[PDB]
CSV table of C-alpha atoms and ligand atoms in Angstrom, one decimal:
chain,number,residue,atom,x,y,z
A,17,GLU,CA,44.5,-32.6,4.7
A,18,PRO,CA,42.1,-29.3,4.1
A,19,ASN,CA,42.3,-27.4,0.9
A,20,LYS,CA,42.5,-23.7,-0.4
A,21,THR,CA,38.3,-22.9,-0.4
A,22,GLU,CA,38.3,-24.9,3.4
A,23,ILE,CA,40.6,-23.1,4.7
A,24,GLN,CA,39.6,-19.5,3.4
A,25,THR,CA,36.1,-20.6,3.9
A,26,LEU,CA,36.3,-21.1,7.5
A,27,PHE,CA,38.5,-18.0,8.4
A,28,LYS,CA,36.4,-15.7,6.4
A,29,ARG,CA,33.5,-17.6,9.4
A,30,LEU,CA,36.7,-16.5,11.7
A,31,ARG,CA,37.6,-13.2,11.1
A,32,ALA,CA,33.9,-11.8,10.7
A,33,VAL,CA,33.9,-12.5,14.4
A,34,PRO,CA,33.7,-8.8,16.2
A,35,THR,CA,35.7,-9.7,18.4
A,36,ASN,CA,38.1,-11.6,16.0
A,37,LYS,CA,39.0,-8.3,14.6
A,38,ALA,CA,41.3,-6.4,17.0
A,39,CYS,CA,45.0,-7.9,17.3
A,40,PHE,CA,45.1,-9.7,20.4
A,41,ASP,CA,48.0,-7.9,21.9
A,42,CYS,CA,47.3,-4.3,20.5
A,43,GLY,CA,43.8,-4.3,18.9
A,44,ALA,CA,45.1,-3.0,15.5
A,45,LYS,CA,42.4,-3.4,13.6
A,46,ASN,CA,42.1,-6.5,10.9
A,47,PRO,CA,44.0,-8.5,12.6
A,48,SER,CA,45.3,-10.9,9.9
A,49,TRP,CA,48.0,-13.6,11.3
A,50,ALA,CA,47.3,-16.4,13.8
A,51,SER,CA,49.3,-18.0,17.1
A,52,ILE,CA,48.3,-21.1,16.8
A,53,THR,CA,49.2,-21.9,20.4
A,54,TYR,CA,46.5,-19.5,21.5
A,55,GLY,CA,43.4,-19.8,18.9
A,56,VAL,CA,44.2,-16.0,18.9
A,57,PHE,CA,44.2,-13.4,15.9
A,58,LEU,CA,47.6,-11.3,15.6
A,59,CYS,CA,48.2,-7.7,13.5
A,60,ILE,CA,51.3,-8.1,11.9
A,61,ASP,CA,53.8,-6.2,13.9
A,62,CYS,CA,52.6,-8.1,16.6
A,63,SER,CA,53.6,-11.4,15.1
A,64,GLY,CA,56.8,-9.9,14.8
A,65,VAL,CA,56.6,-9.5,18.6
A,66,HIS,CA,55.5,-12.7,18.5
A,67,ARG,CA,58.5,-14.6,16.4
A,68,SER,CA,60.8,-13.4,19.0
A,69,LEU,CA,59.3,-15.3,20.9
A,70,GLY,CA,59.6,-18.5,19.9
A,71,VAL,CA,57.8,-21.6,18.2
A,72,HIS,CA,57.6,-22.9,22.5
A,73,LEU,CA,55.8,-20.1,22.7
A,74,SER,CA,54.1,-18.9,20.4
A,75,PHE,CA,54.0,-20.8,16.7
A,76,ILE,CA,52.5,-17.8,13.8
A,77,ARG,CA,51.2,-18.7,10.9
A,78,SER,CA,49.2,-16.0,8.2
A,79,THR,CA,45.5,-16.6,7.8
A,80,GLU,CA,45.6,-15.3,4.6
A,81,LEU,CA,49.2,-15.6,2.9
A,82,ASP,CA,49.8,-19.9,3.5
A,83,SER,CA,47.9,-21.8,2.5
A,84,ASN,CA,50.3,-24.9,5.4
A,85,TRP,CA,47.2,-25.0,7.4
A,86,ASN,CA,45.8,-28.6,8.6
A,87,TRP,CA,42.6,-30.3,10.1
A,88,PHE,CA,44.7,-29.5,13.9
A,89,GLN,CA,45.5,-25.8,13.4
A,90,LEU,CA,42.9,-25.0,11.9
A,91,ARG,CA,40.4,-25.8,14.2
A,92,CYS,CA,42.5,-24.1,17.7
A,93,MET,CA,41.6,-20.9,15.8
A,94,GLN,CA,37.8,-22.6,15.6
A,95,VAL,CA,37.8,-23.1,19.4
A,96,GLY,CA,40.4,-20.3,20.2
A,97,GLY,CA,39.3,-17.2,19.5
A,98,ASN,CA,40.2,-13.6,21.0
A,99,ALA,CA,37.4,-13.0,22.8
A,100,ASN,CA,37.8,-17.5,24.5
A,101,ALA,CA,41.1,-16.1,25.1
A,102,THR,CA,41.0,-12.3,26.2
A,103,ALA,CA,38.6,-14.3,29.4
A,104,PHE,CA,40.9,-16.8,30.4
A,105,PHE,CA,43.9,-14.4,30.3
A,106,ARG,CA,42.0,-12.4,33.4
A,107,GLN,CA,41.1,-15.0,34.7
A,108,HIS,CA,43.4,-16.4,35.2
A,109,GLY,CA,45.1,-13.5,36.6
A,110,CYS,CA,46.9,-12.5,33.8
A,111,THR,CA,46.3,-8.4,32.1
A,112,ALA,CA,50.5,-8.0,31.1
A,113,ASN,CA,50.7,-5.8,28.4
A,114,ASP,CA,54.3,-6.6,27.3
A,115,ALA,CA,54.6,-10.4,25.4
A,116,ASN,CA,57.4,-11.3,27.3
A,117,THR,CA,55.5,-11.0,30.3
A,118,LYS,CA,52.1,-12.1,28.9
A,119,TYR,CA,53.0,-15.0,27.2
A,120,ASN,CA,55.6,-17.0,30.7
A,121,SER,CA,52.1,-16.6,32.6
A,122,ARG,CA,50.7,-19.3,34.6
A,123,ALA,CA,47.5,-18.3,32.3
A,124,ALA,CA,50.1,-18.6,28.6
A,125,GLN,CA,51.0,-22.4,30.1
A,126,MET,CA,47.5,-22.8,31.4
A,127,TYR,CA,45.2,-22.3,27.9
A,128,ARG,CA,47.8,-23.4,25.3
A,129,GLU,CA,47.5,-26.1,27.4
A,130,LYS,CA,43.5,-26.2,26.9
A,131,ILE,CA,43.8,-25.2,23.8
A,132,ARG,CA,45.5,-28.3,22.3
A,133,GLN,CA,42.6,-30.6,24.1
A,134,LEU,CA,39.9,-28.1,23.0
A,135,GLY,CA,41.4,-28.8,18.6
A,136,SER,CA,42.5,-32.0,19.6
A,137,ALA,CA,38.7,-33.3,20.7
A,138,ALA,CA,37.3,-30.8,17.7
A,139,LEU,CA,38.6,-32.9,15.2
A,140,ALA,CA,36.5,-35.7,13.4
B,216,LIG,ZN1,49.0,-5.5,17.4
């Protein structure tokens, strides 16, 4: 299972990507929360909004405070990222800002499948 240095080293790389420096939902700076489901970075407020969606629509974990990351979850973050998600969503007909509408979209459904596949494929 990944250790602290492995987790921290990886998120330093990922959060250094400029497109990962703005919350996926609201654009707020320096998002430190993740929805593993979509491989996206969220600000603390939006992390709370995602909690109301429920774990089957969005699985939330801190990239800073929480060290319960497994390799699959880390790889979802790596194969994902905010740029990839933003492109996929618009390209599959979803530019809704409202979280309930956005995460029940056909695009969100297709994307969580894509993330699982790519994340799985990313494992050694
Ligand atoms: Zn936000």
